RNA sequence: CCAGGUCUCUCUCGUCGAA
RNA sequence: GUUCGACGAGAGAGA
């Protein structure tokens, strides 16, 4: 993805966007108990911690496009993936305005406590001034649809969140692109039946993990993979996507009965963004905050492995490839081992910079012992081998607890951590419970015991 | 005082409804 | 007491 141009807003006719410069993360009563290195990431340009220039570094993700045409491999992959997607047999209908607004079977409601996007943000209007979950009133929305129409500029926000050290002084913060209420609704009316069918079909069929619940679905996964495994990591997936991939996506969309709306995709590689007092244009790159960015990023990953397979292993049957993607994250298998190192090579020739799985330094064979999905390991239960635990290493469960946004929520924060932590096992779980109860409000919490989480975990298959 | 995207899953709270 | 459902708000994690 390339920035095509960028200039002061006041002379493109777009308003100056004012954004907060103070983080909402204060240290917690557990800050000095556990250990960890992550500070809140950089928000403004004057941050005392900075090594480099701010603005220069956060837009650095926009690599520059690489391809423009869909080649014979991409074209091939398209038919296979689309071919595969066909068995799903998924409703091609437009979704009605009421649904796409207020939720329906497979799709939640719009998020009524987040920005409404341009123009509303600057006109002083929140989603709740337009939406009402009780009345379920379209109309006033339909108005603002007819006024402002669609294809509006995104509002670019710095993401308020904890981040490693090397990435703070290096100013490698993350950017949010707030979709306009108007486009979210439009997008959902066009694709909110596609959305629902990926949501209810996570697996090697869709090649997507959206909708799945790792507590349960971790057991279905070994079953679905083939013999030898392969996997990698990406350096800035969303921003490295060249427009040609949007074309391969649209072909797949065309193939399965979405012909009409497939020009909506164009609104994604070509797009306009508002950032404080400037305005800019970007060609390529999937923007953060659109509707469906989760699902589209997955589909394109499914296409990236099929292409890079065909390319690098000349003569290969794609029907024996089982994968699941969650955006750029992915778990992947094959009958015979494949060399992720080769793909990474024959792959920068597509704009994608690939690396080894789990911040490794060398493409090592992928085993059920060192593989991760959604930052969790796989470990079979001692007493019941067929039931797999998703295991998140305590390292960054630690990092999350040393910090809060509102101490009034400490009970809920920590109890969520416990539901993640216990899969490490009774020892480390109680070990953890011990360091929590060693400050006054630690002792006061209401925390479950290993036995209670283990019982319930098992019951949840019954 | 507020400001800060799209989703997915879970948990907690509050409402009405259930022998 | 607790369970169960529907519907609203909060929060955590993951992409």
Author numbering: 1 to 462
Original paper wording:
Last, we further extended the length of the RNA duplex to 30 base pairs with a longer (GA)3 locking sequence in the r5 RNA and were able to obtain a third structure of the PV polymerase EC at 2.9 Å resolution (PV_r5). The original junction in the PV_r5 lattice is interesting because while there is density for the nucleic acid phosphate backbone, the bases themselves are only weakly ordered and appear to be loosely associated in multiple conformations. We thus consider this junction to be “sticky” without being highly structured, and it is this stickiness that presumably allows it to accommodate both translation and rotation of the polymerases into a new relative arrangement without destroying the crystal lattice altogether. In fact, the PV_r5 structures shows the downstream template RNA helix rotated by ≈180° such that the 5′ end of the non-template strand sits atop the fingers/thumb domain junction, but again there appear to be no well-defined interactions locking the RNA into this alternate orientation. Consistent with this, the set of PV_r5 structures show the downstream helix rotated by ≈180° such that the 5′ end of the helix is closer to the thumb domain than the fingers domain, but again there are no specific polymerase-RNA interactions that lock the nucleic acid into this particular orientation. However, the PV_r5 and CV_r2 crystal forms continue to diffract and the resulting structures show they accommodate translocation in two different ways that further illustrate the utility and flexibility of the engineered coaxial stacking interactions as a crystallization tool.
The replication of positive-strand RNA viruses relies on virally encoded RNA-dependent RNA polymerases (RdRPs) that are capable of rapid and processive synthesis of the 7–14 kilobase viral genomes. To examine this in further detail and to validate the polymerase–RNA interactions seen in the initial poliovirus EC structures, we here present nine new coxsackievirus, rhinovirus, and poliovirus elongation complex structures at resolutions ranging from 2.1 to 2.9 Å. All the complexes feature an upstream RNA duplex that is pinched between the pinky finger and thumb domains such that the RNA exit channel is opened by ≈4 Å as compared to the polymerase alone structures. All of the complexes show the open conformation for the active site wherein the β-strands of motifs A and C are not hydrogen bonded together to fully form the RMM-fold that is commonly utilized by polymerase active sites.
